Paper text:
As a standard structural component among protein nanocages, ferritin exists ubiquitously in both prokaryotes and eukaryotes. Structurally, the 8-mer protein is a heteropolymer that is composed of two different subunits (Hα and Hβ) that originate from the same polypeptide. We have described here a protein-engineering approach to convert the 8-mer protein assembly with C4 symmetry into the 16-mer, 24-mer, and 48-mer protein nanocages with higher symmetry by controlling the intra- or inter-subunit disulfide bond.
To determine the possible difference in structure between 8-merΔ3C and NF-8, the crystal structure of 8-merΔ3C was also resolved. Similar to NF-8, 8-merΔ3C also comprises eight of Hα- and Hβ-type subunits at a ratio of 1:1, which assemble into a bowl-like structure with an outer diameter of around 9 nm. Although the structure of 8-merΔ3C is similar to that of NF-8, their packing pattern in the crystal is completely different from each other. For example, the side view of the crystal structure revealed that 8-merΔ3C molecules array in a repeating side-to-side pattern to form two-dimensional (2D) protein layers, where two adjacent bowl-like 8-merΔ3C molecules having opposite orientations are connected by two salt bridges. Support for this idea comes from the observation that the melting point (Tm) of the 8-mer bowl-like NF-8 protein is about 76 °C, while its analog 8-merΔ3C’s Tm decreases to 73 °C due to a dearth of the intra-subunit S–S bond.
Author numbering:
A (entry chain G), B (entry chain C), E (entry chain A), F (entry chain E): 10 to 171
C (entry chain D), D (entry chain B), G (entry chain F), H (entry chain H): 4 to 146
The structure:
């Protein structure tokens, strides 16, 4: 059967993908630590979400070795840009990103049809992480975002603080 | 006496009416829970008041039966619209709403002339809600909004968060 | 055009959800009116009055969960009229429960229907949700 | 033009409230006058100063209940001069004192007036408010 | 001596004055209670300061009666206007007002030269009230008052909410 | 050895420079207390940081007397301007300053090469003060600073209130 | 021109405060200087070290009380240079002591001067301040 | 051009930082690789799995300490690819349990080298930071 070698190939792509997002969210994070962006909360958000997607790839690697399979590590590609211009654009990307990262996670459940259903837990949390990202893109826009640097400052404070 | 069947008839209009508002209020709530709107505290506001107009119509049916009358339920008409445009518009509406809802709740008391004066507590409450409603429509207009999506955001947090 | 958060969510589902919403909403409305049959002195079963007000509120929350699901996956909520119960006077000993328990079928079935439609369109998120939101609504007696 | 919140609130009540605003305000002013007398050395009845300052802040509070009602039904508050009180024999043994009851009568009277005006115009809200507020305005002295 | 009648007549003009202050502030307060400028929190500001210039005139009449003098009560003239236009113009007036309230309070101390120095504790608190008024006027001006009605909202919340 | 006289000379330049830092942040501090400026939180900032650079000079003199050195005090010169224009331009000066105050604190360590490394602990916080200083300049410009004076009001409330 | 908040504040008072701000600050600079003479191993009077770091902090808070009055009355704070103390190597640390004597005197003096300039220009607020501030300042030194 | 917060930070130091940012990020990768090496049913050394997940996060935090120093001194963070755990041809018990020896060597070495460069460019803050970061790093491998 290719089912056992198709599915151990999927855990690896996701592991190298859920690790990628880890990188991007980290690159994003310290784009906001820098003095000429200086939105300490934007930093705190992604950096947490960066840990979340690290802890998420780490579960994939423990499911692999449980299911007998083997762990094929690939280069963690550097994100597409290291200057994310704006908060509104950093969100537009992490949205585009958790969506492409969620594209494959789906191909991983329709091809497993486990009785374990192990990952199904982290499939629900990625979806909670998408609506939150859309909600965050919408507010920035109406707030005459993104250019109004005022708008981003208040969102840093009143949305990424509580 | 037509008085026993007038009242039981004005009760059934109000029951279906105080029902409608709940529906209208539920529609508004999840018009803000949707990602192109994204004002959770708006969403939170109406879904409490929906429950409160619901709690208000549940009393009406317990009063009907307390009075021995009969409960003639009518269709809960779909609220006029499913997209409420802006926060400011949604408020202007439920102001139009709880005002027209009060109009017959007036026709109800004057046609009653009870010794029990039971709904007088809820008559006293439909009025606190209307003052608050204009109070919210006014703060919004002067905030340059709604053409200023910023405005609606800030109100979402500063007035609808405490 | 398209909502910025939509994924693997097929158009036949977005509609079927909105079907199940007006449904469950109808379910709150009959369950509601029902609690208030038993409450009339002609009946006087605070027990059975009591239980149907709760099943009204739980069915509405169900509606809520669904709505929050709709907007969660980027689909739009198009409400319809919550039709007045085609029932009118439920009444008698061991009564109208028949017309009552019934909807516990058509509600639950429309869900299992939704369950097969999700498997058809390979939407695993939708599947788990409905399975969580069928098991729950299970329990029939007393519940 | 019209305030966005008005409802079955007849222009006569709006003027009648505002007239009850200046009245309670005058009532506060006089009670104050009376109060700061019992304090003077020629009389030195701190018991009475005590009651008349307290009632001084309570008729002012009354006044505010009403203004908060005014802006609540949607009407506009027009304030007038608080006329000086006619009083001086602010002292004695069996006198002057009650000459203030004329106040408790005319105050409490203009209220019952406002109550019949509510009932003529069919504003059950204004009515239950005036009734609560007059009953609140209870009887005279206590221990 | 006219000094005994000088001072006891200054106490009265003042009693009639610090009373006026109370009245104006109370007029101001419920201008922000009404539905066309629903501010609430402003409203809490002045109505407390009306209490503070009432309890302040209440002390004046206790002193007159201690200093043997007499209490000559004059009309409480209606405030200059019963519409204040803008939170900005409410503050500006009370600055001007407390400024004219304080002018005479000076003519009251310079013409007293007591050993008791009674009112000198209330002369120090009307100055804390003057700096704080201009502090509220200044912030509102640079906010862009009034029109940007947006300004008066934020000031309402972030200045008067704490 | 000139070393004992170059280092005891470098201690005094700095004592007369971190003292000057104390004087600028005070002249800054009470330019915000004034009624036509009135940012109570801006004031609280420099009046605490001003305390931070007076405690900083008091350590220098105790180290001068510890290493046997002698304390040569100079005039504490009046700061460049006693009217700082804008919350943003005070931050640009205090930044421009803490960088020139740190320019010499460097020459003082490269010329020291202790086994004690006494002022090494204070070098690590003058750098925490600069990153922070730029972080606030950038939000201000950013916080769409300045012009719309409001910017500075929100920054006074939202960044400097917590 | 004029600040929106000034009253009965004469342009002389405005200037004599500012003289009083530079003074007190000069005091904090000398008292600071003194503490670290008693701190040097050549003197090793920690108690006198100790007493004079506290006199420095407190004559600086003084200056701040004064600045906050300036802006409180509506005048403008024009700061001058805090000159070095004429002192430097208090040989006999009694020279140190005699320095402060002529300091406590010139300070307390400029204050009492501010006191009669206030009586001159009929500014009862400025006067009560300087008085509290002088009484505060009095008190020899136990300790 | 230039960031508003840079001071005596030679561009040499800025480049040498971003190298150690990719280096210490690479190390998060290997230790992870190793860690889950021991978790496989074939090795079953939970203890070693556990310790390498610890050192994966603890060197990735290191990475952050660095980037945050970067943006502290005013320099710009440019990530590189986190190369795979080169892994010549290894994954059986008792294997390149080394690997990490040379890894810590090249990590701590590149650190120690960075110490010589601050000393050359007279950058005491960068030098003070790394001595701590290395001492922290030292002591560990065991027991």
């Amino acid at each position: 059967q290719n089912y056992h070698q198709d599915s151990e190939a999927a855990i690896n792509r996701q592991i190298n993908l859920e690790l990628y997002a880890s990188y991007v969210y980290l690159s994003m994070s310290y784009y906001f630590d820098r003095d000429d962006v200086a939105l300490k909360n934007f930093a705190k958000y992604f950096l947490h979400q960066s840990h979340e997607e690290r802890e998420h790839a780490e579960k994939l690697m423990k499911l692999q070795n449980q299911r007998g399979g083997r762990i094929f590590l690939q280069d963690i590609k550097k994100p597409d840009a290291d200057d994310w211009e704006s908060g509104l654009n950093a969100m537009e990307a992490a949205l585009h990103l958790e969506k492409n990262v969620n594209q494959s996670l789906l191909e991983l459940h329709k091809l497993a049809t486990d009785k374990n259903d192990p990952h199904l837990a982290d499939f629900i949390e990625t979806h909670y992480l998408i609506k939150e990202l859309g909600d965050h893109v919408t507010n920035l826009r109406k707030m005459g975002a993104p250019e109004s640097g005022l708008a981003e400052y208040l969102f840093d404070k009143h949305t990424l603080g509580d």
